[PDB]
Write a protein that binds this ligand. Structure first.
Ligand SMILES: NC1=NC(=O)C([C@@H]2CCNC(=O)C3=NC(Br)=CC32)=N1
Length: 340
């Protein structure tokens, strides 16, 4: 149960670098990585775009002294209350990051620390996330409202599935937070699963839940079960990601107030119209039977009836996948970002 000190966790890491910040002229460095701008601030960590050798990198900053103060209740097994700081959570996130090595997952290239401040060195995925959220999901702009073409979606889904194969099957890790935010894309254009901050190791293929992002949580979480199968949880979440990719919106879980949310998921049936339906009125093409055939296999309420990562991978939908679809999109999308 109890993980040790950070030192004990990183005691087996082979590329642990000693923290050295410094300032040369108007520029701020972290071990030769020049600080450009912060790409995204998640208020448990920030992600920093950096430069070293005419190459771009992305360095996830964590801070022990800031994280150990944030302390929520968890309630133990034994009546007597237990407390867990968000730093405890990071201890587990480290261990995980420390052993992800995969071409479909975001793998770190080295960890920089002084045992308080941590910087995790990742490759820079020039196209940020799969989609960006602001009152709704969009590709590039709020004024330009484009839908990711289906021929390209396939790749994205195929690519993440492969990630799933590695974390579930090779590593025995459940992601527990599959989200457009965490599905990252470069210019070339590969797609890699990232962010392991809710991830944990499975026990006989299962997890102990009520943790992640509410609209991406499976119906199981709303039964009297305590152990849910980890793989299928990730799969459901990918289903939501697909739904989001389809109609650029969250399913029945349309935010506003969240009792409506938690009371719907477990029993309410998902409506499957044609792309712009949900998105028409905050502005004032579409899809086929086969498209929904695949998404429904993902979003089945009973998880045992829900499609495996195995069956999904070898399905008729992804049979006609072409990486040239993802390549052109990613290369063109990158062209539009450069000066935006
Ligand atoms: N949730 C996230 N965990 C992460 O490690 C990231 C990264 C770091 C990987 N590389 C990049 O280039 C990124 N661009 C953007 Br936006 C975010 C990220 N996000």
């Amino acid at each position: 149960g109890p993980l040790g000190s950070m030192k004990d966790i990183l005691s087996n890491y082979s590329n642990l670098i000693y923290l050295n910040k410094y300032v040369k002229e108007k520029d701020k460095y972290i071990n030769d990585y020049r600080i450009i701008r912060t790409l995204n601030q998640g208020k448990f960590n920030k992600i920093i775009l950096c430069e070293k050798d005419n190459k771009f990198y992305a360095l996830k900053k964590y801070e022990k002294s800031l994280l150990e103060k944030k302390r929520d209740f968890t309630k133990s097994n034994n009546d007597k209350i237990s407390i867990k700081s968000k730093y405890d959570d990071f201890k587990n996130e480290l261990q995980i990051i420390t052993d992800i090595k995969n071409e479909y997952c975001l793998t770190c290239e080295g960890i920089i620390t002084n045992y308080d401040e941590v910087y995790i060195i990742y490759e820079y995925m020039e196209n940020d996330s799969i989609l960006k959220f602001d009152e709704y999901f969009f590709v590039l702009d709020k004024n330009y409202t484009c839908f990711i073409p289906i021929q390209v979606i396939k790749c994205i889904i195929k690519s993440v599935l492969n990630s799933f194969s590695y974390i579930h099957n090779e590593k025995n890790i459940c992601h527990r937070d599959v989200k457009p935010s965490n599905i990252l894309m470069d210019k070339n254009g590969r797609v890699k699963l990232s962010d392991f901050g809710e991830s944990e190791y499975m026990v006989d293929k299962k997890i102990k839940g009520s943790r992640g992002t509410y609209e991406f949580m499976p119906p199981e979480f709303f039964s009297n079960e305590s152990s849910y199968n980890g793989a299928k949880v990730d799969i459901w979440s990918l289903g939501i990601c697909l739904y989001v990719m389809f109609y650029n919106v969250v399913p029945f879980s349309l935010k506003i107030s969240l009792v409506e949310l938690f009371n719907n998921i477990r029993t309410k049936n998902i409506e499957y119209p044609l792309d712009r339906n949900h998105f028409l009125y905050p502005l004032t093409n579409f899809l086929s039977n086969e498209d929904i055939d695949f998404l429904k296999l993902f979003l089945r309420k009973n998880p045992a009836e829900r499609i495996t990562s195995e069956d999904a991978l070898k399905h008729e939908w992804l049979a006609d996948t072409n990486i040239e679809d993802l390549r052109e999109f990613s290369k063109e999308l990158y062209k539009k970002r450069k000066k935006l």
